[PDB]
């Protein structure tokens, strides 16, 4: 992004953690996505389950 | 620490940009003040010149 | 920020001038004027500096620079006093450092400077050159800086270019010298930097100097011969950097503010003909700004440019343009007020001007004259069915039907449009 | 510019609808004229 418009904008991203509940993801592929879809028909479990 | 140097980088961007903006506003206002002096000196030049021609 | 790095380098060194406190090699008598006055933050120090009668302020520190000749130390000894000569809150202000005895201490001691441009020589020299506007002194010799290399070498290389430009735009506030500089080739210098595509902030500085020059009416009259304003509009369109547009709008406002003689202001029209700023100003009005200066300039431009658009609305000038044989695209060709309030004007003596345009359609086949005439005829004949029957009586309907076979397809299309303006009830 | 092209197409559509209306009217006239 900085290269596209040279402006030397560092776009600093600091890191933190608080009471926020984070999203949930686990990688799937063509050989397993439909099965994860069957699992997700019933909702999704808690973070880090 | 990369985080602390990054905080310093954010600071050096922020203060520098804000200084540049403030100085820019200052010079624009000063230029307007200079033209204010100019319009003013013109008005009173007219006010004086009238009586000057009269008396001479 | 190269100059900032140099300042960081030199500011971290406290000069060992106390060992030279009475040394004739360096500051035998100036070192008590550095021991005293070491606190530039003290008002009593500045008051004492005034008490000394300018005996050594801008009187002995000048030529103290010549007491010093080693380079690795000239920079630091320069900075040790130039922080005072530069920061300058109220310490010197209105040329408190008079030095009335000698004119080698007043100003024309700069000639030895401007040499070997690399160890901040021309740079402090330029700073000293910028000692006119907010100081109690006047530039004795304009020519001795107007053509020198201090401003020529900086054309291409660059924080120092910004520093020199800053010094120049600081210098460019008193119309007495600026009229002489514009009569000189300074405008050529600004043009050369302008056509030298560079950083956006540099462009802000050129447009800034141009606006400050636009303070003066005689100068805008002299610069009218140049196409400054179409290029300013093009920069505005092709470069969005906030302050750049701010100063550009300031320049436009100045140019439509002064207006010494409306006749020589053909730019009232050429500002929008060369670049119709109105659509962009509408897009900016659409946006909301907390700076009332920018919004005020925008509104002023909408107003003045609208008045100029209304000035373009006329029929005598438009008909002279019709008669000239070269149909320029004066914007009235599409004006709805032109085709409603004064459509009957086109029916001059026995439809005189329609006949003239018919003749010029028959004779000339340039694409744009044909387009202008055919479109205008269509817009007229829209409102006048008897005008349609008259145009049919002219035979020009068949002339357009034959223009339908011109080599350029745009001409065929505008003839097509004319025919479908005639097709109604036909 | 693209929506100006679209206005060009819209004007085309109205123009050709009017021209077909005019066509059918003119043909009606020609049908009238076929008789002694």
**In A, which residues are within 8 Å of B13 by CB distance?**
10
C393's tokens: 């009586």
Residue C372: CB atoms within 10 Å: 22
Sign of CA dihedral C130, C134, C138, C142: positive
Which three-class secondary structure string do you get for D1-36?
Answer: CHHHHHHHHHHHHHHHHHHHHHHHHHHHHHHHCCCC
**In B, which residues are within 8 Å of C243 by CB distance?**
21, 24
d(CA B35, CA C174) in angstroms, rounded, equals 10
CA dihedral C79, C82, C87, C92 (to 10 degrees): 160
**In D, which residues are within 8 Å of C420 by CB distance?**
15, 19
d(CA C252, CA C297) in angstroms, rounded, equals 8
DSSP character for C120?
S
Contact C315, C330 (CB under 8 A): no
Secondary structure of residue C116 in the 3-state scheme: coil
- Return the residue in A7, A9, A10, A16 with the most chain B beta carbons within 10 A, the one to mutate for interface testing: A10
Q: What is the resolution of this structure in A?
A: 4.4
d(CA C124, CA C130) in angstroms, rounded, equals 10
d(CA A17, CA C241) in angstroms, rounded, equals 36
Interface chains of chain D (3 or more CB pairs under 8 Å): C
C131's tokens: 């000692």
Contact C124, C111 (CB under 8 A): no
Query: Is the minimum CB–CB distance between C173 and chain B shorter than 8 Å?
Result: yes
Experimental approach: cryo-EM
The residues near C357 (Cβ < 8 Å, ≥ 6 apart) are C322, C373, C376, C377
Contact C140, C108 (CB under 8 A): yes
DSSP codes joined into one string, C340-406? HTSSGGGS-TTSHHHHHHHHHHHH---HHHHHHHHHHHHHHHHH-HHHHHHHHHHTHHHHHHHHTT-
Residue C183: CB atoms within 10 Å: 12
């Amino acid at each position: 992004g900085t290269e596209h418009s040279g402006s030397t904008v560092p776009s600093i991203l600091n890191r933190m953690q608080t009471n926020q509940t984070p999203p949930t993801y686990n990688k799937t592929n063509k050989f397993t996505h439909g099965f994860q879809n069957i699992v997700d028909a019933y909702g999704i479990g808690t973070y880090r389950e | 620490a990369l985080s602390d140097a990054d905080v310093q980088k954010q600071i050096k961007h922020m203060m520098a940009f804000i200084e540049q903006e403030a100085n820019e506003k200052a010079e624009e206002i000063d230029a307007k003040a200079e033209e204010e002096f100019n319009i003013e000196k013109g008005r009173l030049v007219q006010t004086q010149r009238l009586k000057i021609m009269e008396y001479y | 920020n190269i100059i900032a790095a140099k300042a960081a380098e030199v500011r971290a060194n406290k000069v060992n001038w106390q060992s030279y406190l009475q040394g004739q090699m360096i500051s035998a008598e100036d070192c008590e004027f550095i021991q005293r006055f070491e606190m530039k933050r003290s008002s009593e120090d500045k008051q004492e500096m005034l008490q000394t009668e300018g005996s050594q302020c801008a009187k002995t520190f000048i030529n103290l620079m010549t007491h010093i000749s080693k380079e690795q130390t000239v920079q630091y000894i320069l900075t040790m006093v130039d922080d005072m000569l530069q920061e300058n809150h109220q310490r010197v202000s209105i040329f408190f450092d008079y030095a009335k005895r000698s004119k080698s201490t007043a100003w024309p001691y700069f000639l030895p400077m401007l040499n070997r441009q690399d160890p901040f020589t021309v740079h402090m020299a330029a700073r000293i050159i910028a000692k006119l506007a907010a100081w109690g002194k006047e530039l004795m010799e304009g020519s001795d800086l107007n053509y020198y290399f201090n401003w020529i070498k900086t054309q291409l290389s660059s924080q120092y270019v910004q520093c020199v430009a800053g010094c120049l735009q600081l210098m460019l506030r008193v119309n007495e010298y600026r009229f002489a500089w514009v009569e000189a080739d300074g405008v050529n210098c600004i043009m050369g930097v302008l056509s030298n595509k560079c950083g956006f902030q540099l462009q802000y500085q050129m447009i800034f100097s141009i606006w400050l020059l636009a303070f003066s009416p005689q100068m805008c009259e002299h610069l009218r011969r140049y196409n400054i304003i179409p290029v300013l509009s093009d920069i505005l369109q092709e470069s969005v950097k906030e302050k750049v547009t701010r100063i550009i709008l300031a320049a436009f406002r100045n140019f439509l503010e002064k207006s010494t003689e409306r006749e020589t202001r053909q730019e009232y029209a050429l500002a929008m003909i060369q670049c119709k700023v109105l659509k962009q100003l509408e897009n900016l009005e659409q946006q909301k700004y907390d700076d009332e200066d920018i919004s005020e300039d925008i509104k002023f431009l909408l107003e003045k440019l609208g008045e100029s658009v209304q000035d373009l609305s006329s029929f005598d000038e438009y008909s002279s343009e019709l008669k000239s044989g070269r149909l320029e695209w004066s914007p009235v060709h599409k004006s709805e007020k032109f085709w409603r309030e004064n459509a009957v004007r086109l029916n001059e003596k026995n439809y005189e001007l329609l006949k003239i345009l018919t003749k010029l359609l028959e004779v000339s086949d340039d694409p744009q004259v044909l387009a202008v005439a055919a479109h205008d005829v269509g817009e007229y004949v829209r409102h006048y069915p008897r005008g349609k029957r008259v145009i049919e009586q002219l035979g020009g309907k068949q002339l357009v039907m034959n223009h339908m076979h011109h080599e350029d397809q745009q001409v065929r299309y505008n003839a097509l449009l004319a025919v479908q303006k005639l097709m109604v009830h036909n | 510019n693209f929506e100006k092209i679209e206005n060009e197409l819209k004007e085309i559509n109205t123009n050709q609808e009017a021209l077909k209306r005019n066509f059918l009217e003119l043909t009606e006239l020609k049908f009238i004229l076929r008789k002694t």
